[PDB]
C-alpha cells in the first residue's frame, strides 16, 4: 500500500491510500502525467493532481479556478510542465521570462501585470501572482495560458492576454463615460462599466483621448469622441503598431511590437528613473525612446473633463 | 407520487428515456435542462411535457461522449450557451436577399449576418456534425440553429457586439482546411531571404491588406532589422482566400472579388455590411438590399476565390 494526497487546488489535500497495483482518474505529479505510472514508494506522502471526477472535487476546482471546464487542469498541467522549466530573470526589480517558445508576448504581459493595480478574483490567480512576484512565475504563466486557451510555443497578443485576465479581475466598479459628437447625428453620451471601461483601441495617447479623437460615426463623416469621466486605477490605450515617442514620467509601461499581424517580436518599456526597455532577460536604459508601440498603460484615480 | 416519462438528449439524435417526478424541478433531476431553447431548469414537469425531448448538459460518460461526437467539444457549458442563444435566434427572421439567407437586424447580429452571407459563398466542409447539419439548414432558409451554434462556438452571446473576421476564424478551425497550402517569401536587404509554408487556417487568412493582387506583388512589412522588408505570396492552394485590414476607404470592382465586409465606425462600436459581386455590386444590410455599378467605402475583409497560384517573381 501507499498513502498519498489527491487534490485539485494543491491547497486542499485529500488523504487517499492508493494500492500498489489508472485507479483515481487522470492524475499528475508536479506537472508530469502519472497515468501510466504504478506508485513508486518514492511517492509516499507526495501530492498528486487528479482531474475532478466527483461533486466534492468539482466544486473545489470551481472555487479555486472559477471555471467548470474539465479541460482546464489538463491544459494547465501541460503548460506547467513547460513553464516550470523556464527561467524568470529578475530585471530592474521585476520578474521577467527568458525567451523560450515564443513567450515574448507572455513576458511583456507579466511585467505589465506587476506594474498596474489589479485584484484577481480566482484564488489560483491570486496565489500565483504572489508566487510570480517572489521570483517563481511558473504557476502564473501556466494559468494565463490556460485561461486564454493557448499552448506553449503558440503566439499571442499582449492586449488580448490582458483582456482575458481583466475578465477574472474585480474591475466591476471601474467606470468610463464617453461623449461622441457628430455634426449630422448630434451629441450622445455612453457609460461603460467593468473591463470595457479600462480598455481602448484607436490611439496610444491618453491626452488625445481626453482632448477628443476623430472617429467615423455611422453618418460616414468624422466625429469627435472624447473622455468625459474616468474612474479606474489604470487605463490601457492601444493602437496598431506605429512609430511613437515615449516620454519619461508620462506613462507606466508600454508594449513595443516589431513585425506584422502574422509574426512579430514583443518588447516591454517601463518608466522608472529613466526609460528601461526589457526584452527577455536583456535590459537597455534610455532617457528618450521612440519606436513601434502598440500598448501604453497609464495610472489613474478619477478624472472629469473640461469640455 | 406523479411521474411523466420525458426524453433527454444533447444532440437530439440519441434519446434517453427518463421517468421524472413531478414533485421536483428538472434541475434537481437532470441539472440545467432546456426545452426548445427555453430554460426549464427550475420548472417542475407538467402533464404537457410527457413524451417531449429536453436538452441537458453532459452528466455521464455517454452524455459527455455524445456531446463531443456532435459538437467536437467537452465543455459542458457549450450547450448552455448553444440553446440559450437558440432561444433568441429561433425568433429572428431569415429572409432571402439576392438568393442568400440573411438575417433581419436584431441584437447587433450584423457580424453574424455578414458572416452567414459569406459562408454561403465560399467552399467550406465542416468537421463537427452539428455544424454540417445546421449549415445545410441555414442555406435552406433556417439558420436559427446555425447561428446559435456559431455564437456558442465563438463564446459570444446574443446582443454582443461581434467581429466578422474573428467569427470566420473560429468557424475555420472547425472546418477541414487541411489540404490548403500557402508559401510566402520575405526578403529584407539586411536580414536576408527566408521562405515559409503555412497549412490549414493560417493558409487562407491574412491581416495587413485587402488586395490579393498586392499580396502577390509584395507588401511592405517591418523586419526587426529596423528596415522594411517585402513579403509576397509564392504559392497558394485553396478554394478561397480571406484578406483583412483595419477599416479604410477602398474601391471594390465588379468581378474581381467574391464578397466583402464593410465596417463603418471604430474598434469600440461600428456597423457591418456585406458587399457581394454578382452581375453588379449588391450591398446586403440585414433585410435591406441596395446596388451600384461601382463601390467605394470602408472595407475590412475581402474574399477571393482561388484554385492554385504560383508566382512568377
Ligand atoms: Zn454621425
Ligand atoms: Zn530584416
Residue numbers in the entry:
A (entry chain C): 4 to 24, 29 to 314
B (entry chain A): 2 to 314
How is this structure described in the published paper?
The papain-like protease (PLpro) of severe acute respiratory syndrome coronavirus 2 (SARS-CoV-2) plays a critical role in the proteolytic processing of viral polyproteins and the dysregulation of the host immune response, providing a promising therapeutic target. The papain-like protease (PLpro) and chymotrypsin-like protease (called 3CLpro, also referred to as main protease) are two essential cysteine proteases encoded by the SARS-CoV-2 genome. Both of them are required to cleave two viral polyproteins (pp1a and pp1ab) to generate 16 mature nonstructural proteins for genome transcription and replication. In addition, SARS-CoV-2 PLpro recognizes and cleaves the C-terminal LxGG sequence of ubiquitin (Ub) and ubiquitin-like proteins (UbLs) such as interferon-stimulated gene product 15 (ISG15) to remove the Ub and UbL modifications from host proteins, respectively. The deubiquitinase (DUB) activity of SARS-CoV-2 PLpro is thought to induce dysregulation in the host immune response against viral infection and replication.
As a result, compound 2 is designed and synthesized based on the fusion of VIR251 and compound 1. To gain insights into the precise ligand binding mode, a crystal structure of SARS-CoV-2 PLpro in complex with compound 2 was determined at 2.5 Å resolution. As expected, the contiguous electron density is clearly shown between C111 and the P1 group of compound 2, demonstrating the covalent bond formed between the protease and 2. In addition, the P1–P3 groups of compound 2 form multiple hydrogen bonds (H-bonds) with the main chain of N109, G163, Y268, and G271 as well as the side chain of Y264. The superimposed crystal structures of SARS-CoV-2 PLpro in complex with compound 2 and VIR251 reveal that the protein-ligand interaction patterns of the P1–P3 groups of two inhibitors are highly conserved. Meanwhile, the side chain of Y268 is in a closed conformation as anticipated so as to form π-π interactions with the P4-naphthyl group of compound 2; a salt bridge is also established between the side chain of D164 and the piperidine ring of the P4-position. The superimposition of crystal structures of SARS-CoV-2 PLpro bound with compounds 1 and 2 reveals that the P4 group of the two compounds employs a highly similar binding pose in the complexes. Therefore, in the SARS-CoV-2 PLpro-2 complex, two fragments individually adopted from VIR251 and compound 1, bind to the pocket as we desired, highlighting the elegance and utility of the structure-based drug design in significantly facilitating the development of new inhibitors. The resulting IC50 value of compound 2 is 0.46 μM, which is about 100-fold and 5-fold improvement in potency compared to that of VIR251 and compound 1, respectively. The melting temperature (Tm) of SARS-CoV-2 PLpro incubated with compound 2 significantly increases compared to that of apo protease (68.0 °C vs. 43.3 °C) and it is also much higher than that of the protease incubated with GRL0617 (68.0 °C vs. 50.4 °C).
